Paper text:
The L-arginine biosynthesis pathway consists of eight enzymes that catalyse the conversion of L-glutamate to L-arginine, appears to be attractive target for anti-Tuberculosis (TB) drug discovery. The arginine biosynthesis pathway consists of eight different enzymes ([Fig fig1]) all considered to be essential for *M. tuberculosis* growth *in vitro*. In this work, the ligandability of four enzymes of the pathway ArgB, ArgC, ArgD and ArgF is explored using a fragment-based approach. In conclusion, using a fragment-based approach, we have discovered inhibitors that bind to novel sites in ArgB and ArgF and to the active sites of ArgC and ArgD, which in case of ArgB show on target activity against *M. tuberculosis*.
Additionally, structures were solved with 4 fragment binders, occupying either of the two distinct pockets: the substrate-binding ([Fig fig2] and [Fig fig2]) and the NADP(H)-binding pockets ([Fig fig2] and [Fig fig2]). As compared to NMR571, NMR322 binds deeper in the pocket ([Fig fig2] and [Fig fig2]). Enzymatic assays revealed that 2 mM NMR322 inhibited ArgC activity by 45% whereas 2 mM NMR571 caused a 37% inhibition. Although the thermal shifts obtained for NADP(H)-binding pocket fragments NMR401 and NMR863 were higher than those for substrate-binding pocket fragments NMR322 and NMR571, the SPR binding response for the latter was better and positively correlated with percentage inhibition of enzymatic activity (**[Table tbl2]**). Our results further show that in the case of ArgC there are two possible strategies to develop inhibitors, with one targeting the cofactor binding site and the other the substrate binding site. It is not clear at this point which strategy has the highest potential to result in potent inhibitors.
Residue numbers in the entry:
A (entry chain A), B (entry chain B), C (entry chain A), D (entry chain B): 9 to 352
The structure:
């Protein structure tokens, strides 16, 4: 049996991990058990006060996020996508399966880390994006998982097959729209409903967003050419969803680009290549662990266009974490993870 | 095995029935098969062109809605919440399980039917709201189910325990907000995104809405008093969800009303009574078959207040249909029906 | 000339007052001048950092909210709809025209005030709802204005003509949906976009909302019958707008009720009575100072239904303040206040 | 006095033209009169049945769109952004001021027109984007105006100063999010509220969108180089607003690019260059004729980034039409056109 703790249970990523665990077949047959649920504030409150959608766990008392509380759990989700978990991870029993939703163990270049995060690089753990070349093998039986960022998940799935096949130039452009749950649950004026509803805005533009080097790192793993990444995130008035529009120069026939996506994804159950003449929409993947992808060539502009839609909280965060957890535990990789969206 | 057809498969209710069937344990172990998917238009198209979220069924070819196509199935969902199924249903065998999402077999008073629907009364089938007193008995082993309207589902769950215990007056007021998927998929200018987004409006007010007599009928069934119903629906800029605010005069203490709701709902798997101090929200029930209910007493106004939140497409439509299906077939009532919402 | 200060300039009400002042004909011809803009935090920031829509004032430096900063202004808007301005108002020069967006000077019953607000009653100032009987005369040349709450504005406009004519019973029910800007700009988890989008919820139900006695007070001014108010507010995923559904028992002919609304509003430029067969929508009044009102009778339920739509930030807050300011200064009452909404 | 007709009055662009005319100073002092309001359907209905926000015109009777009805007016708005006005415009006098919101007279290359629109090229009229180099000269005293498309307006304001100064490469990438009112009022299933709310999707990708050659044409006019345009539009769940993210390779320093934008826009009343450290948002420009623009350089990616926010219905359509009208008639260009957004 695997007893699971969720640190940061009261945030959006933590609530979504718990939603997926409650629906997981190992929860139903007793193999997966939900233990301590912790938060940095509001210890002593009940979970229902934070996540009224999780009624089977409503009565659970939130505990402080402390190593002692997290002891005795075979797996610990560090559900702080915008936090720094290196210090807490060091405090846990090292045989624990530690699944970090944050960034501390994602990057593999210490100088890049220090430039973008302002601290000493902690190192890296197996990246929880099983569809990326070579990634699945590193996750089988791992006791450490670095969950990818939500935007890099969409951009890498959209772009890596074309670049791996050397069919596009290695200077890529990504403009990705995101619902606001990706910002997490910390209350700020700029994330208030009145501000977000009816409005769209780019933010952290022109290379300052910390997911820029994460996209570059994933792409550099499938090519030896010099990769550059122009990444612009755009907040839109939705709660969930990322639609990444990804471009690069190309002079390759569309059919050869489509063949590269076929080769990458034909046997990947969470990656859906759109039928000819269809394009992804985030509405179709909400609540699912799926990515819907379409590709095209703008011949006049000599530009490849790849569109990818994911649910930022599922395939971009908690679904990635659970998918990687399945691989870590030797369980069927698709367990608990639907490809069917909740639409409209 | 139970071979199931879905007529009206390309509409919202039909797509949500299919989502639930795809996740149903009887589909997973082969006891339930998804057969013919039909529509009144676009026969020959594929389901993926209508429901991109249902990728496991994307290649299914939509067939014409005809009694011949629907014969040879053990169960038939008539997934036309705004259609009139009487003529088609009369062509199907009494032994075929028919689950009608439309209104034709909901009402038990022919004169009321004629007044509000302007046609001859087709009859009455067991009402697919298993939590109503006596309803579960009528559904077990039925081959006929009339699924309730979405607004009546919310209003009846909010009000029937108080009224059945004679703890409120039988003159009730319901003001219910709803997302736009309740209107179905028929394109009209009043339901365009640009019109609906950022706007709220009441419609079909002051007793002309056809769900008014349906609420009255369900409430009359739990009391011996003349029931009157003031029902105002309000369209809001959401795709799913109904939040029903329901009021009635009372002279009874809150403690007695609370006890009546506990007694009615403590063992009901889909009905969640909010802990004291918490109130329902539609976000918490989206994608689930749950209803979240809270009750209160306005002492100064001598008024009972009951709030109910449901997903209009699940507990208000397709989830009720599948729940009643489970009962009709002798399967565990909760099969395929989660109480956990997809939030935020 | 009238030099105007706005205290609380960085909140939503303060930003909307400034929007209306910038468009006011007295600003254009030099008679109205915009002076100090203050806030409790962020003094030294520029206004553009808080209200990027107010580009003509973007460079203004926010000053601390202090009596000394507000001196030398002929009119001071206390744009703190959820604050308590009695202490600051006492510090201003008493000949100043003081326009309080908060509640401290709205209520006329000290015991009611203490019950709902937990403090000693400060008194009352002329209520800034000029269409209410007797209200306009108290605002002409006043140096004090208590701006109404947003929900009472909608409910009182919907209900007072029927009650004044004694055509409905004095026990009224109000269920009002509101966009989230009415909560103000203080960051809380429950007002975050991810939480608000796609969700609706009632709050402060069963008589605990402080606008309940404000509605009762306005209605008691048009009748000597004992008034009771059941008031339920519902948050919906819009930034602006209140749609109030208001009911009461009646046995009066609809035509007599319509005549009462005609008598009240035929000469009121901001009150639009819907043509027969039309119903209000908040989308149609956004950005305008208008209220759109329809009335009906549910004969089966013996219930009067009145629907009122306003923009909560204009007719429900800042437009009420500017309308009352015009009356205070002896300026045309409609100056700077459009009846045309910004739709879709 | 200038008697104005609006053909297509019942659509979104027509309603927004009428909103602006109602607030125009020439309407207030009688120099502009609103004459015939026409549509291709529902002649005989009243305007209030189409545009409930335009209550001062609610009683106007919609007339058939015919050259006879439109004659006898000094100015005619053809408010059909997706219509083809060539045949109707050829029936009107050269001395009548015609302002076409549609595309028929925008393009200057007949072969490009035939390729993208599949019809004979009707000709070219002065392009209604007064801020483009040389455009104001062409509009003064014209009797013919082709209003720009909404996406080209945003992309050209974002990009032309950099390209005209030869500070970026002439291969540009535009990814622009838009609210749904840009689609007009024609009811289709893909534009239903339930579909659009909570979803984002790219459409008409990889060079098939008809605004691609329009962007290319406007950019070609400021440079001597071959221009290529990769343009991806993305529909988001808002009613109004376009946020264009525009990129191009560059070797020029940020200081030089910033200076070029200051030089181009410092005296342009509707173009607001964001203070350093601020970025545009569509919420800040809704209901205004303003464009908010920020520029940046991604040094690692050697990429220039320009962000532009407009209201698609004002600066992208009806505001551009009225602005160009003012120029054609010799009225102050800013008459009736505020730069202040209606936010939140
Ligand atoms: O961009 C990010 O890294 C992340 C985010 C992700 C998706 C959408 C919005 C969003 O905003 C914030 C705000 C604070 C901290 C992190 C984020
Ligand atoms: O009210 C209804 O009966 C139903 C509906 C339900 C929820 C939300 C909107 C809505 O609108 C329409 C429109 C056409 C036909 C039926 C409906
Ligand atoms: O209800 C209110 O009095 C007011 C409010 C008005 C409209 C919409 C939401 C809303 O929520 C809050 C939250 C905090 C303080 C005041 C409010
Ligand atoms: O893209 C366009 O040309 C235009 C449009 C503009 C903004 C947003 C959506 C939108 O969709 C449609 C649909 C039909 C016809 C034109 C459009």
């Amino acid at each position: 049996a695997t007893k699971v703790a969720v640190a940061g249970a009261s945030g959006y990523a933590g609530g979504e991990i718990l939603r997926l665990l409650l629906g997981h077949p190992a929860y139903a047959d007793g193999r997966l058990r939900i233990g301590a649920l912790t938060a940095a504030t509001s210890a002593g409150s009940t979970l229902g006060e934070h996540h009224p959608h999780l009624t089977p766990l409503a009565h659970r008392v939130v505990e402080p996020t402390e190593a002692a509380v997290l002891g005795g759990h075979d797996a610990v989700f560090l559900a702080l996508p915008h936090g720094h978990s290196a210090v807490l991870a060091q405090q846990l029993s090292p045989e624990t399966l530690i699944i970090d939703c944050g960034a501390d163990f994602r990057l593999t270049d210490a100088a890049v880390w220090e430039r973008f995060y302002g601290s000493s690089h902690a190192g890296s753990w197996p990246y929880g994006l099983p569809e990326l070349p070579g990634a699945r093998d590193q996750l089988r039986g791992t006791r450490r998982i670095a969950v990818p960022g939500c935007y890099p998940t969409a951009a890498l799935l959209a772009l890596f097959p074309a670049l791996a096949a050397d069919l596009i130039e290695p200077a890529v452009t990504v403009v990705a729209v995101s619902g606001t749950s990706g910002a997490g649950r910390a209350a700020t004026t700029d994330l208030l409903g009145a501000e977000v509803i009816g409005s769209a805005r780019a933010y952290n533009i022109a290379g300052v967003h910390r997911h820029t080097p994460e996209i570059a790192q994933g792409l550099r793993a499938v090519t030896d050419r010099d990769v550059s990444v122009s990444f612009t995130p755009v907040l839109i008035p939705a709660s969930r969803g990322i639609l990444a529009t990804c471009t690069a120069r190309t002079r390759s026939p569309l059919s050869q680009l489509r063949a590269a996506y076929e080769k990458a994804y034909h046997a990947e159950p969470f990656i859906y290549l759109m039928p000819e003449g269809q394009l992804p929409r985030t509405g179709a993947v909400i609540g699912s662990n799926a990515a819907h992808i379409a590709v095209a060539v703008d011949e006049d502009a000599q530009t490849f266009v790849a569109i990818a839609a994911i649910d930022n909280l599922v395939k971009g965060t908690a679904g990635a974490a659970v998918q990687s957890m399945n691989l870590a535990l030797g369980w069927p990789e698709t367990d608990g993870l639907s490809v069917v969206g909740v639409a409209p």
